[PDB]
Scaffold this motif. Sequence first.
Motif, PDB file in Angstrom:
ATOM      1  N   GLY A 102      63.334  37.220  16.963  1.00  0.00           N
ATOM      2  CA  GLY A 102      63.384  37.110  18.405  1.00  0.00           C
ATOM      3  C   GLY A 102      62.992  38.414  19.067  1.00  0.00           C
ATOM      4  O   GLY A 102      62.530  39.363  18.428  1.00  0.00           O
ATOM      5  N   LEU A 103      63.194  38.463  20.384  1.00  0.00           N
ATOM      6  CA  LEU A 103      62.753  39.629  21.144  1.00  0.00           C
ATOM      7  C   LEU A 103      63.792  40.745  21.120  1.00  0.00           C
ATOM      8  O   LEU A 103      63.495  41.872  20.709  1.00  0.00           O
ATOM      9  N   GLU A 104      65.016  40.451  21.568  1.00  0.00           N
ATOM     10  CA  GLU A 104      66.033  41.492  21.682  1.00  0.00           C
ATOM     11  C   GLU A 104      66.408  42.074  20.325  1.00  0.00           C
ATOM     12  O   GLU A 104      66.774  43.251  20.237  1.00  0.00           O
ATOM     13  N   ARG A 105      66.322  41.276  19.260  1.00  0.00           N
ATOM     14  CA  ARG A 105      66.613  41.798  17.930  1.00  0.00           C
ATOM     15  C   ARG A 105      65.468  42.658  17.409  1.00  0.00           C
ATOM     16  O   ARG A 105      65.700  43.649  16.708  1.00  0.00           O
ATOM     17  N   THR A 106      64.228  42.292  17.737  1.00  0.00           N
ATOM     18  CA  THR A 106      63.092  43.133  17.376  1.00  0.00           C
ATOM     19  C   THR A 106      63.089  44.420  18.190  1.00  0.00           C
ATOM     20  O   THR A 106      62.811  45.501  17.657  1.00  0.00           O
ATOM     21  N   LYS A 107      63.404  44.320  19.482  1.00  0.00           N
ATOM     22  CA  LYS A 107      63.457  45.503  20.331  1.00  0.00           C
ATOM     23  C   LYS A 107      64.547  46.460  19.868  1.00  0.00           C
ATOM     24  O   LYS A 107      64.332  47.676  19.808  1.00  0.00           O
ATOM     25  N   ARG A 108      65.721  45.924  19.520  1.00  0.00           N
ATOM     26  CA  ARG A 108      66.816  46.757  19.035  1.00  0.00           C
ATOM     27  C   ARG A 108      66.436  47.504  17.764  1.00  0.00           C
ATOM     28  O   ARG A 108      66.865  48.646  17.562  1.00  0.00           O
ATOM     29  N   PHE A 109      65.629  46.884  16.902  1.00  0.00           N
ATOM     30  CA  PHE A 109      65.187  47.553  15.684  1.00  0.00           C
ATOM     31  C   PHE A 109      64.286  48.740  16.001  1.00  0.00           C
ATOM     32  O   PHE A 109      64.498  49.847  15.493  1.00  0.00           O
ATOM     33  N   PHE A 110      63.265  48.524  16.835  1.00  0.00           N
ATOM     34  CA  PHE A 110      62.310  49.589  17.124  1.00  0.00           C
ATOM     35  C   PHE A 110      62.950  50.722  17.914  1.00  0.00           C
ATOM     36  O   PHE A 110      62.527  51.877  17.792  1.00  0.00           O
ATOM     37  N   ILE A 111      63.965  50.417  18.724  1.00  0.00           N
ATOM     38  CA  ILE A 111      64.678  51.470  19.439  1.00  0.00           C
ATOM     39  C   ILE A 111      65.472  52.328  18.462  1.00  0.00           C
ATOM     40  O   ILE A 111      65.498  53.559  18.574  1.00  0.00           O
ATOM     41  N   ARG A 112      66.123  51.694  17.484  1.00  0.00           N
ATOM     42  CA  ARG A 112      66.884  52.445  16.490  1.00  0.00           C
ATOM     43  C   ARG A 112      65.973  53.335  15.653  1.00  0.00           C
ATOM     44  O   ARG A 112      66.341  54.465  15.313  1.00  0.00           O
ATOM     45  N   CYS A 113      64.779  52.844  15.311  1.00  0.00           N
ATOM     46  CA  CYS A 113      63.824  53.665  14.575  1.00  0.00           C
ATOM     47  C   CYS A 113      63.438  54.902  15.374  1.00  0.00           C
ATOM     48  O   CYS A 113      63.460  56.024  14.855  1.00  0.00           O
ATOM     49  N   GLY A 114      63.075  54.712  16.643  1.00  0.00           N
ATOM     50  CA  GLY A 114      62.702  55.847  17.469  1.00  0.00           C
ATOM     51  C   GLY A 114      63.844  56.824  17.656  1.00  0.00           C
ATOM     52  O   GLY A 114      63.639  58.040  17.655  1.00  0.00           O
ATOM     53  N   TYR A 115      65.067  56.303  17.794  1.00  0.00           N
ATOM     54  CA  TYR A 115      66.232  57.160  17.991  1.00  0.00           C
ATOM     55  C   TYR A 115      66.420  58.117  16.820  1.00  0.00           C
ATOM     56  O   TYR A 115      66.758  59.290  17.018  1.00  0.00           O
ATOM     57  N   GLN A 116      66.201  57.639  15.593  1.00  0.00           N
ATOM     58  CA  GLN A 116      66.366  58.503  14.429  1.00  0.00           C
ATOM     59  C   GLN A 116      65.250  59.536  14.341  1.00  0.00           C
ATOM     60  O   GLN A 116      65.485  60.679  13.930  1.00  0.00           O
ATOM     61  N   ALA A 117      64.028  59.153  14.715  1.00  0.00           N
ATOM     62  CA  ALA A 117      62.925  60.108  14.695  1.00  0.00           C
ATOM     63  C   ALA A 117      63.129  61.206  15.731  1.00  0.00           C
ATOM     64  O   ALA A 117      62.768  62.365  15.494  1.00  0.00           O
ATOM     65  N   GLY A 118      63.707  60.859  16.884  1.00  0.00           N
ATOM     66  CA  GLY A 118      63.990  61.866  17.892  1.00  0.00           C
ATOM     67  C   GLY A 118      65.026  62.873  17.434  1.00  0.00           C
ATOM     68  O   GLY A 118      64.904  64.071  17.706  1.00  0.00           O
ATOM     69  N   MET A 119      66.063  62.402  16.737  1.00  0.00           N
ATOM     70  CA  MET A 119      67.026  63.320  16.140  1.00  0.00           C
ATOM     71  C   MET A 119      66.364  64.190  15.081  1.00  0.00           C
ATOM     72  O   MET A 119      66.599  65.403  15.028  1.00  0.00           O
ATOM     73  N   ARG A 120      65.539  63.582  14.222  1.00  0.00           N
ATOM     74  CA  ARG A 120      64.801  64.338  13.214  1.00  0.00           C
ATOM     75  C   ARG A 120      64.002  65.464  13.855  1.00  0.00           C
ATOM     76  O   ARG A 120      64.074  66.621  13.425  1.00  0.00           O
ATOM     77  N   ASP A 121      63.227  65.136  14.892  1.00  0.00           N
ATOM     78  CA  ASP A 121      62.437  66.152  15.579  1.00  0.00           C
ATOM     79  C   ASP A 121      63.329  67.162  16.286  1.00  0.00           C
ATOM     80  O   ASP A 121      63.047  68.365  16.266  1.00  0.00           O
ATOM     81  N   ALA A 122      64.407  66.691  16.920  1.00  0.00           N
ATOM     82  CA  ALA A 122      65.291  67.599  17.642  1.00  0.00           C
ATOM     83  C   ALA A 122      65.957  68.597  16.706  1.00  0.00           C
ATOM     84  O   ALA A 122      66.217  69.737  17.104  1.00  0.00           O
ATOM     85  N   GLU A 123      66.235  68.193  15.464  1.00  0.00           N
ATOM     86  CA  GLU A 123      66.827  69.119  14.503  1.00  0.00           C
ATOM     87  C   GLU A 123      65.903  70.301  14.239  1.00  0.00           C
ATOM     88  O   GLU A 123      66.367  71.433  14.060  1.00  0.00           O
ATOM     89  N   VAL A 124      64.594  70.059  14.216  1.00  0.00           N
ATOM     90  CA  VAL A 124      63.640  71.135  13.974  1.00  0.00           C
ATOM     91  C   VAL A 124      63.392  71.934  15.248  1.00  0.00           C
ATOM     92  O   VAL A 124      63.413  73.170  15.238  1.00  0.00           O
ATOM     93  N   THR A 125      63.157  71.241  16.366  1.00  0.00           N
ATOM     94  CA  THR A 125      62.785  71.933  17.595  1.00  0.00           C
ATOM     95  C   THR A 125      63.952  72.710  18.191  1.00  0.00           C
ATOM     96  O   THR A 125      63.734  73.706  18.891  1.00  0.00           O
ATOM     97  N   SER A 126      65.192  72.283  17.932  1.00  0.00           N
ATOM     98  CA  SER A 126      66.339  73.009  18.466  1.00  0.00           C
ATOM     99  C   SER A 126      66.485  74.394  17.850  1.00  0.00           C
ATOM    100  O   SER A 126      67.187  75.238  18.417  1.00  0.00           O
ATOM    101  N   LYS A 127      65.847  74.647  16.705  1.00  0.00           N
ATOM    102  CA  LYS A 127      65.811  75.999  16.159  1.00  0.00           C
ATOM    103  C   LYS A 127      64.735  76.840  16.835  1.00  0.00           C
ATOM    104  O   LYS A 127      64.957  78.019  17.129  1.00  0.00           O
ATOM    105  N   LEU A 128      63.565  76.248  17.086  1.00  0.00           N
ATOM    106  CA  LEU A 128      62.460  77.000  17.670  1.00  0.00           C
ATOM    107  C   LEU A 128      62.740  77.389  19.115  1.00  0.00           C
ATOM    108  O   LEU A 128      62.285  78.443  19.572  1.00  0.00           O
ATOM    109  N   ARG A 129      63.470  76.552  19.849  1.00  0.00           N
ATOM    110  CA  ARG A 129      63.825  76.828  21.240  1.00  0.00           C
ATOM    111  C   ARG A 129      65.298  76.491  21.415  1.00  0.00           C
ATOM    112  O   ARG A 129      65.655  75.361  21.777  1.00  0.00           O
ATOM    113  N   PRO A 130      66.191  77.452  21.159  1.00  0.00           N
ATOM    114  CA  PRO A 130      67.628  77.148  21.178  1.00  0.00           C
ATOM    115  C   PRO A 130      68.251  77.262  22.562  1.00  0.00           C
ATOM    116  O   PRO A 130      69.352  76.751  22.789  1.00  0.00           O
ATOM    117  N   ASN A 131      67.562  77.925  23.487  1.00  0.00           N
ATOM    118  CA  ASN A 131      68.088  78.155  24.832  1.00  0.00           C
ATOM    119  C   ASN A 131      68.405  76.845  25.555  1.00  0.00           C
ATOM    120  O   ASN A 131      67.526  76.208  26.137  1.00  0.00           O
TER     121      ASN A 131
END
Length: 191
Positions: A49-78
């Motif tokens: 369905g739609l809402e279950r497919t949307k919930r999946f892709f949102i969860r995927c993006g959410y984890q990638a944002g944390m992954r990226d934030a873990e790296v970028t938060s060192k380069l720019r900690p301010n």
Amino acid sequence: DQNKDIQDLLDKIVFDAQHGQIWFDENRMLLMHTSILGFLRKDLYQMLGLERTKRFFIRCGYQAGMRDAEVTSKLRPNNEAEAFMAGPQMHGIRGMVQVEVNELHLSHDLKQFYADFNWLNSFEAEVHLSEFPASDQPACWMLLGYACGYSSFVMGQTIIYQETHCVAQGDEHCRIIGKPLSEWENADELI
Ligand SMILES: [Zn+2]
């Protein structure tokens, strides 16, 4: 020459073609076709369905944002906007979307956050349109999860985004609004 704003991020990307590896700091990366991500959206919609497919892709993006934030938060900690833009810049570097700022107010100390961003050249909108005609609702779910995931990490609080406009809806480009969970009236997000 033109990458003065993102040179610290570009330096952490290592291509090792002879050994079949791409590295973004300690994260391993792949270079994949956008057309292949339509297939996942495709089969998942028909199966879940739609809402279950949307919930999946949102969860995927959410984890990638944390992954990226873990790296970028060192380069720019301010509490600095130029430090926060590492996320929007990583979205562009990885070939997913171009972020254009309409308004950005933020502060880690005051726990305040307001984001009004345009999304240009959204990969997800193009991918969505290549499998389905123009939709009734915005379609950039993976991009929206990444916005929520990255922003919540670097801010230290739940930051929820909403795509007000989307190319896949017929609008000229995509647009999002980011606020803390307390500033949304429908603050019951099942993802
Ligand atoms: Zn969109």
